[PDB]
Symmetry: none
Subunit: 168 residues, 3 copies
């Protein structure tokens, strides 16, 4: 199923996700729906809290052929280093982009779709995406890193997008 | 979560649902998402196959205040009698309505959200909704009861609607 | 403010009202205008749909000293028994009256003007008034209970009345 993606300024985007207790068939359905939603909306990452499911589940695909599914359940950041920034987008802040300070290199531990633990070292685009998605799970958005004026301009542009999408 | 509702002429609307093996937390999550979707779309009934979940699950609320949740899992029709018809709508055939022949009274057995069996005798609006929703589960739409030329009128109306609502 | 009361054969009288989401200051202004309208026209009950406001709000005051106000928001009928009938009037059917079958005794649950829930058992005139007003909210009029010939006659009476009303 394709789930509805929340937009700012929805306050559900600010909730802190709980850890997944057990990777069972219910969790695997959520993971599969989240991929289906992410590809439908043409994103490269999606966190459960964006679809109003407040558990620590992220899906990512940064591949050119869109055939490289990465699942992070209960991710934990072990190490990071360096600093970078790319103009980031977000399905919850549609059509807006802004440079945000990130670590350049990241090492994480997570469970996969089978609930098996794995470690992953990432740099480049992948490292940035993982950090962006992990921020969601604690209720943080990329606009939070920006000045109060930039934050206001972004909120306003999104509220205008959505007015028109809703046209009676 | 709010799920996407399929529209004609999607072929997945014609699939025959499988019975629910076990009413567990996964099924209860589906039921809760289905209610959330139905209220969001302002419908009075929704079948699982309309949100691309091909299991025998129906949610209904025909109440005035929208606070009377009825769940039918693995419904079976035990008895029916009489004949009626109102102008029926459907979230999968947006904004179209047509009078369809139905039984006036219906007696069904089903499992509730806890997986407990129950029997229900219905007439009036409820009886009509139950039959409409049970039709979905075997891949049948209300337009199937109409002449080829009304079916063609309805399919065109809906396609115009969707096309001319789809800006990127 | 005094609102305009719709007359038959206005089709807005046949719309089904939505439940009130939240009893806030806007809803409380509507309630106050509805009372002001009802007293102005000298009625004993008024439903929101009669003034082209399609939410589940009803005001009733049978008192002589216009000082026993009753507000029903999102009413629900819990129990009914018996059968009665008096010659009912309606501000939407100017100057016409007809005996209509009603339940004699009625038990309802509703929200008051503050949005606090309450239960009310009624008989006599109040019970009939409550049923009459609850009908308005699902688009029913008292003339709907009468023969086709009686209905046509009432429609004509009212149209003749409003025809004279407007003069130029
Ligand atoms: Ni994001
Ligand atoms: Ni339907
Ligand atoms: Ni009336």
């Amino acid at each position: 199923s394709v789930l509805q993606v929340l937009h700012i300024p929805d306050e559900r985007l600010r909730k802190v996700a709980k850890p997944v207790e057990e990777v069972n068939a219910e969790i695997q359905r959520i993971v599969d729906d989240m991929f289906e939603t992410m590809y439908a909306e043409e994103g490269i990452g999606l966190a459960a809290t964006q679809v109003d499911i407040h558990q620590r589940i992220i899906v990512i695909d940064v591949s050119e052929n869109r055939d490289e599914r990465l699942v992070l359940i209960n991710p934990e950041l072990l190490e990071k280093s360096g600093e970078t920034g790319i103009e980031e987008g977000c399905l919850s802040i549609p059509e807006q982009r802004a440079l945000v300070p990130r670590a350049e290199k990241v090492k994480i531990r997570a469970l996969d779709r089978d609930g098996k633990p794995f470690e992953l070292e990432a740099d480049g685009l992948l490292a940035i995406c993982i950090q962006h998605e992990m921020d969601h799970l604690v209720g943080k958005l990329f606009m939070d890193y920006l000045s109060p004026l930039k934050q206001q301009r972004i909120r306003q542009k999104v509220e205008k997008l959505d007015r028109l999408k809703a046209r009676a």
